[PDB]
Amino acid sequence: PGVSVRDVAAQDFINAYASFLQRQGKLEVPGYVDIVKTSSGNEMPPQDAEGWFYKRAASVARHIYMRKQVGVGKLNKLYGGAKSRGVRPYKHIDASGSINRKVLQALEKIGIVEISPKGGRRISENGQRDLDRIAAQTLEEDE
Amino acid sequence: ENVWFSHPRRYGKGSRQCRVCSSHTGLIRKYGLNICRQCFREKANDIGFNKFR
Amino acid sequence: IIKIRITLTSTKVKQLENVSSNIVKNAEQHNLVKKGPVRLPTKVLKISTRKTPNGEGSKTWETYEMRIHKRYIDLEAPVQIVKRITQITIEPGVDVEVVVA
Amino acid sequence: QHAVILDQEKYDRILKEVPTYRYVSVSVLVDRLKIGGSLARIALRHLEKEGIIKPISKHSKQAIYTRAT
Amino acid sequence: THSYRGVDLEKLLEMSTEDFVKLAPARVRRRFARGMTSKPAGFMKKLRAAKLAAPENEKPAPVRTHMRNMIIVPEMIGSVVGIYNGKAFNQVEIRPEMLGHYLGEFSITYTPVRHGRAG
Amino acid sequence: SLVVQEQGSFQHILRLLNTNVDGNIKIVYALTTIKGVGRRYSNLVCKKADVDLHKRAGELTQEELERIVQIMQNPTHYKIPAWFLNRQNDITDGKDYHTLANNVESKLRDDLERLKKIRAHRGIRHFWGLRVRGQHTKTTGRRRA
RNA sequence: UUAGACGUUCUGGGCCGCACGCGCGCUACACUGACGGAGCCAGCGAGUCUAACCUUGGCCGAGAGGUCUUGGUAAUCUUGUGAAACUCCGUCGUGCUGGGGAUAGAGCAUUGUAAUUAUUGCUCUUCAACGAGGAAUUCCUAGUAAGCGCAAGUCAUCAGCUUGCGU
């Protein structure tokens, strides 16, 4: 009867949308996609070395869908976690900014988010149209 | 004598001091107060800092 | 007429509420639209000194508080009656500022 | 210690012994068989795509399986 | 045979102190990027003027100083400096491999332990 | 259902860069017994050498191991950036070297001996056998060993 | 004591120096776990006019950080402080091992007149003891103990400390 991404489970939508972005093959993943730790609190690079970048692009687009607008500073606080600094206690550490900025620029070039008044980036005309189509397919997976 | 007071005092405990007794130990500079710990406790009532809970 | 705003700030509840009451009482003595007193959240300013001079004894701590109460009233009035109502209600302990527009 | 590569003498031991296992799981394989733990977590997938054991709950930290029939 | 970071020792002396810093580490690069009004000329004038004392024979006269926080540059190579440890000036001849180091690294400020064993 | 039945090509402990690499653990963490590679250097060199990371070390036929040791001994030619490198603008050359298995203990020995013969303060602390960085000694660091 | 000063001020150094004993603590000894993605939830507060405080957003950079701007003298902006433990999916698989991260090497930055006796942050490398701790001994009765982070004080820079706050 008409569905949005708010009626889809988050993990099951992000996995399904990340596969769709890779199947299209047009996202311009950076050349540094296999070197980077993605945070200074992390220890090791992402394990899924081929498609970890498509999962950030899917996760960020849903996040912009659910919010009004965000910028690369709000994404670094979101995707960062506690850092083990050895003998001293844990603390929150923001994530890597270059990755989030490249994700947002890739999404603008595919034309799914757009630059916004009041700063940040809002979701676009085609953004709502395209997020909701994969949102429709994810409900009807169960045979 | 051009070297008399020539060392810079722009940060740290040497620059700031109490405005009542000119000490450097136990200074309170919250809300721009600039009064030592012991001096503030004797005249917190006059400033308007009462002790409720 | 002109759009005005009167902001009140004090550390005394009893001395502030009656001043705002005089403001609104003069506001409907000669009637005009109120946008009456919107009380902002009270600010508690805490200073936590230790207790003492020199550190002998049990490590006992004090906390001192100053409470800042703030209220603003958004009035509109002719230019004449602005000055008199801003000058009559002047009381010690209460800081009044008036924003022109 | 624990074998990490199938050697076709462990493989037939998989097929003819897990139907006898009424409770079968990752720690069940590594105790009664001598298997590598990460090989067990692959085996419980392989024993599902063709039905020899059936899932009753699949949690990422705990898999619970019974014999299919 | 001696080179600092790929440039030879005879390339070091025929090279200004600005070009040396351009291949130095980050602490040396940062200090002389904000090193305006550091007063470097008073000490360095007494070093070249002490090299004229010895024509070809043994090491020049010591130039004693208090600046422990001064980075060794190639123009200092061959000089001898008395570095104040806090009470006493210690003569140390500036070997070519001392580049990029502070003068306080070569004048210890404490006599170490000698725990027990009065002998 | 990732079951594979390879039986013959598996290998036990094997030598790379004069070090016995355990053959039946995952390749990225198997390489880390070499003194000079770690969990993040070895991951990148496996990615650059194009190795399926899910393989044990008893896999990896000899041309793949030859590719891997080519990456380790010459990283900058295979697009590894210079900030992974263990030595950068090192002390004499100004080149970029990643120090490897037997060279790690020797290049460290070279550096300690280099700053010992200059009688820098770090060298004297190293020769005495004390904590060379600026850390307290009155209560910790006992049992010199 | 008071002018060769015990006044004051300036350059350096020390308070941090280590055969060793003690007190408060932090991190641990792992599978009720580590790592990687994904979910995403607070409360107490602080913040700059003749001075550079809290900083959104864009751009650059692996990161730390840089740069161009912006909002805020504040229930208005930072800030919904999108905190951490936690939750889901996967990799590991009983091996001092992918637990632990001491010690040490090389580089890049930031604060500062100045960083050597590492201020601190980051990147790669190095991979120590520790396998649940003897006699002893501390604190605690319900939104408490314990786990978990956050703000403020000190501050230019430095929090393994404290004062509070919530989960």
* Residue A24 host element (H or E): helix A10-24
Between strands E80-84 and E63-65, the pairing is parallel
Is any Cβ of chain C less than 8 angstroms from the Cβ of B53?
yes
User: Which of F92, F114, F118 lies closest to E3 in CB terms?
Assistant: F92
Distance D51 CA to G132 C1' (A): 44
Distance A63 CA to G124 C1' (A): 34
* Rounded Cα distance, E31 and E72, in Å: 12
Does residue A38 come out as left (phi exceeding 0), alpha (psi in the -120 to 50 range) or beta?
Answer: left
Say which experimental method was used.
cryo-EM
**Residue contact F24–D4, C-beta within 8 A:** yes
Picking from E60, E56, E66, the residue whose alpha carbon sits closest to that of residue E47 is: E60
CA–C1' nearest nucleotide, residue C63: G163
Q: For G119, which residue's CA is nearest its C1'? A: F134
CA–C1' nearest nucleotide, residue E36: G113
* Rounded Cα distance, E20 and E49, in Å: 22
Picking from F87, F88, F89 by the largest number of E CB atoms within 10 A of its own CB, the best residue to mutate is: F89
User: In chain B, whose CA is at the least distance from the CA of C93?
Assistant: B48
**Residue contact F120–E4, C-beta within 8 A:** no
Q: Report CA torsion sign: E71, E74, E79, E80.
A: positive
CA–C1' nearest nucleotide, residue F84: G124
Q: For G122, which residue's CA is nearest its C1'? A: A40
Picking from F76, F91, F15, the residue whose alpha carbon sits closest to that of residue F44 is: F76
Domains with residue ranges and CATH for chain E? 9-105 (3.30.860.10)
User: In chain D, whose CA is at the least distance from the CA of F4?
Assistant: D6
SS3 (DSSP) at F28: helix
Burial A133-143 (b: 16+ CB within 10 A, else e): ebbeebeeeee
Structure tokens at E64: 């004693």
CA dihedral B20, B21, B25, B27 (to 10 degrees): 0
**Residue contact F44–A44, C-beta within 8 A:** no
The residue to which tokens 């790379």 are assigned: F16
Query: Number of CB pairs < 8 Å for B and C?
Result: 33
Burial E105-118 (b: 16+ CB within 10 A, else e): bbbbeeeeeeeeee
What letter does residue E5 receive in the DSSP assignment?
S
Beta strand segments in chain F, E: 14-15, 20-21, 87-88, 96-97
In C, which residues are within 8 Å of B44 by CB distance? 47, 64
* Rounded Cα distance, E110 and E105, in Å: 12
* Alpha-helix runs per DSSP H in A28-116: 52-66, 72-79, 97-110
Contact residues for E53 (Cβ-Cβ < 8 A; gap 6+): E60, E61
> Kindly report the CA angle at C59 between C56 and C65, in degrees rounded to 5?
120
What letter does residue C58 receive in the DSSP assignment?
S
Q: Report CA torsion sign: A61, A63, A68, A74.
A: negative
Task: Please check whether residue C72 is in contact with residue C40, taking contact to mean a CB–CB distance below 8 angstroms.
Answer: yes
Structure tokens at F106: 């020797």
Label residue F45 exposed, middle or buried (CB < 10 Å: 0-12, 13-18, 19+).
buried
Domain count, chain A: 1
CA distance E25 to chain F (A): 9
Picking from A107, A132, A134, A130, the residue whose alpha carbon sits closest to that of residue A26 is: A107
Contact residues for A24 (Cβ-Cβ < 8 A; gap 6+): none
Q: Report CA torsion sign: D38, D41, D47, D49.
A: negative
The bases of strand G with some atom under 7 A from any protein CB are: 9-14, 16-23, 26-28, 32-40, 44-48, 55-65, 75, 79-80, 82-85, 88-94, 97-98, 100-128, 148-150, 152-157, 159-164
**Residue contact F2–D11, C-beta within 8 A:** no
Task: Please check whether residue F28 is in contact with residue F53, taking contact to mean a CB–CB distance below 8 angstroms.
Answer: yes
Distance E54 CA to G125 C1' (A): 47
Chains E and F touch (3+ CB pairs under 8 A): yes
Whole-angstrom CA distances from A105 to A73, F28, F69 are: 14, 33, 37
User: In chain F, whose CA is at the least distance from the CA of A50?
Assistant: F47
Picking from F47, F51, F80 by the largest number of A CB atoms within 10 A of its own CB, the best residue to mutate is: F47
Domain hosting residue A142, numbered range:
1-143
CA distance F22 to chain D (A): 13
CA contacts within 13 A on the Cβ side of E110: 6
Q: Could you tell me the resolution of this structure in angstroms? A: 3.0
SS3 (DSSP) at E13: helix
Between strands D62-67 and C5-10, the pairing is unpaired
Contact residues for E32 (Cβ-Cβ < 8 A; gap 6+): E21, E71
How far is Cα of residue D21 from the mean position of the Cα atoms in its chain?
A: 9
State the amino acid at position C81 in one-letter form.
I
**Residue contact E95–F121, C-beta within 8 A:** no
State the amino acid at position B42 in one-letter form.
E
What does the domain layout of chain D look like in residue ranges? 1-69
Whole-angstrom CA distances from A42 to A38, A80, A92, A109, F45 are: 7, 9, 11, 29, 19
What letter does residue F142 receive in the DSSP assignment?
-
